[PDB]
Amino acid sequence: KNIESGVAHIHSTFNNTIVMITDTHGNALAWSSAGSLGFKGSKKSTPFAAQMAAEAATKVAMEHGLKTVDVTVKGPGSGREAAIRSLQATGLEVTAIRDVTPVPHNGCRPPKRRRV
RNA sequence: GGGAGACUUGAGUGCAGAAGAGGAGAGUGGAAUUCCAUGUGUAGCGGUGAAAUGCGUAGAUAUAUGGAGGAACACCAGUGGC
User: Rounded to an integer, what is the distance from CA A102 to the centroid of its chain?
Assistant: First the structure.
């Protein structure tokens, strides 16, 4: 329950952001998202929704007990900045940041465009 | 134009060097996806102009450690090269 620090996994996309706080070896400690907060439609894709997600997840995580986190960013979208600022505000000192945006190295065929 | 020649500039051979996703055969790789397994954790995930179909409480998404399988080769990479 009570631990020292973990990680911040922030899977931001065009439709939703999903914040997940985990221990350094992996086993999770909290998570939340815009739909969890109660957002709908395009509101899920918002920095405010990412902010509220980080708020709720940090509240639960601090209720368990911790102080600081590393930040593992992944994906497009603009919730990154607002969510990180809200981590700082709700208390978790942002130890460090790194993006792990997967580079396919030309690995897979992506689907067609949204026309033709 | 025909025939008998002669010559080396054209064409080619030889000496020595240069470059190169040039081609065929063989194997090998790291990244990423998908799936499978093990844990964490639990209510939404995904998607849209809006939604909805779908998937998910039988443990989803996500997260961390491996494994299987296929395909394509980030940077270099450029009206650059063959």
Answer: 16
Q: What's the burial of A90, exposed, middle or buried (CB within 10 Å: 0-12/13-18/19+)? A: middle
- Resolution of the model in angstroms: 2.9
Q: Rounded to whole angstroms, how far apart are CA atoms A71 and A20?
A: 10
Residues 13-52 of A with CB under 7 A from strand B: 13-16, 18, 20, 22, 25-29, 31, 33-36, 40-42, 44-45
Residue A37 near residue A19, CB atoms below 8 Å: no
Fill in the amino acid letter for A90.
T
Technique that determined the structure: cryo-EM
E-strand stretches of A17-92: 17-22, 28-33, 68-74
Q: Which residues of A36-65 are buried (b: 16+ CB within 10 A; e: fewer)?
A: bbebeeeebbbbebbbbbbbbbbeebeeee
